[PDB]
Design a protein around this ligand. Sequence first.
Ligand code: VB3
Lengths: 241, 101, 316
Amino acid sequence: LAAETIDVSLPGRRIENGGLHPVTRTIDRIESFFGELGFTVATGPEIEDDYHNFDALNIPGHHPARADHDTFWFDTTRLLRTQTSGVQIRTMKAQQPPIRIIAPGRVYRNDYDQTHTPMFHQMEGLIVDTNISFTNLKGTLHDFLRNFFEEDLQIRFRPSYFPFTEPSAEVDVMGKNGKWLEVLGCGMVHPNVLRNVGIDPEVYSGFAFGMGMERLTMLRYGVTDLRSFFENDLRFLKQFK
Amino acid sequence: ELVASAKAAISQASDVAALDNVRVEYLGKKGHLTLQMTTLRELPPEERPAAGAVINEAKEQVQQALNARKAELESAALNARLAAETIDVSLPGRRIENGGL
Amino acid sequence: PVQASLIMGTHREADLSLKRVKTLLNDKGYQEVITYSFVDPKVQQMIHPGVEALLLPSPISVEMSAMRLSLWTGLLATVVYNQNRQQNRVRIFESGLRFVPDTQAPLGIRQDLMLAGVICGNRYEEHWNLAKETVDFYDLKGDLESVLDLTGKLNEVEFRAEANPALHPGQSAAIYLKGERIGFVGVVHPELERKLDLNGRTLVFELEWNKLADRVVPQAREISRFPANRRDIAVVVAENVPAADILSECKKVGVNQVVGVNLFDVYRGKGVAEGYKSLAISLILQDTSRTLEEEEIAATVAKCVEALKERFQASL
Ligand SMILES: C[C@@H](CC1CCCCC1)NCc1ccccc1O
């Protein structure tokens, strides 16, 4: 009878969807990658003391990577953390192995360029068990990089140094321009680090790793200026819904 | 005397000014102090610049009280707007209910 | 690959996920932003005047030398940034720590995880069937009630009018959960709106995350197979009486018969005295074992309206 014909192509009645920050996209993907491996997410405060940020990581007061570290200090003990190590140290002291945690969070350094902001995000992983080897470090991170970039890409492990690991390594991804690109750092946990948290390095071993979320996000989605992440232009953020 | 007695009757007139008739007191006192400038038609000529400086210092003191009162009134109007815009913050917000699985 | 034991972690169904809350805010039209944790004390002292913040002795700049006491300094700088680029309508949120000096906290500084956001501009973008209307207090409050409803404790939440130097004194509220202040919400005070060069009416909120990271696990209750009855009442009370207290009185003073109390109109004008308002309330009554009749029904709405006689005012 009645013909109340309407144009069904008119825009619908709704409010537009918001999205997540691109760095949050990255952190969420990585948490799901390692969550399937039994890694628990652990968070902690961003202002720390020099013990949980240096001493517990086998970085004495006279160590070079401390004064020459671009660190924000409030006094001689309190600082803006340069890594999310405080939660990892506290977890190891509160329980015996097995340990399987990842630690995301904001960290701080004094530099500020096109490729550097005074604040950025770091994802750090830690596993401690009976027979954790360097071969496990390679395989786990090779699996991670293949999942993160979704391709059988060229990676390499390269000797490096950190006071809290030995052997230490950085891993590079072959850049699209033909050069190797440093993506993360890793190594086997130093026996001093295990010792002062009450873990016997003669019985237990483990590897750890760290990576910057801004760097991986830029490589993943083609972001060319790191400062765009913290200008929060709604036209930049809306691309990542 | 006079130099401050006229400013006393000026700041007191611009004190209990309900509406924006501050300019009405501005009109009357600007003519009173301009007439006081005409009273400098004599006196020692070497002191005439000193007489004009004391009169203009009195005119600046009246203009400061006029600005201070104009600021009091426009803030009083802003406060009146704030009072009228009071709402019941306990009233339910606008939303569609959440569903569950 | 690593060889290890497949041991389950310890799960708690009562945990409410922050990612679940971020998803709801996305599904209500909010964009996540991330701002620097050190801010400009010149502008933070405008939003939180008198509150001493933790300062960096050697900052990258003076405009990034004060650890943030809230997330509002970063969020309000973000809307000004976007409004300076031809975007008046911005609806954003952020999760992150605040840094409040506290002698009882570790390292003398308390670091609480906060969830904050801000909306401004029209409710919707330009639309063929929706009219241009500026966002108001009940728009943001509605979004906040959607967040709090994820905990299953919305019944125990109170929005009390409370003073805040950054907010409109007549359109600001402290948020309480079980007698604890968990956050704030309100329109940015018009003079603060002026000093920050905000384009128009701007509404902010902030919540202490850990106070709502817990939710109620469901427990199946019996449902009555017998019909229910609705009775509407129109109560005239004083203009300064919060309507939620009246609704809470009808729900509390009423026994297990009344199962639903809802407000559907608020009138004041030609018909009601000045300084008074009429609240139209619907009362739904039902019993789990039997059906009700007009005798016991009308005696219960009469019991409810008499409870509003001494504590409040009569009906009409
Ligand atoms: C700073 C450490 C802190 C942990 C190391 C050992 C165990 C304590 C916590 N972050 C993980 C990490 C690992 C290797 C290389 C770089 C890197 O950033």
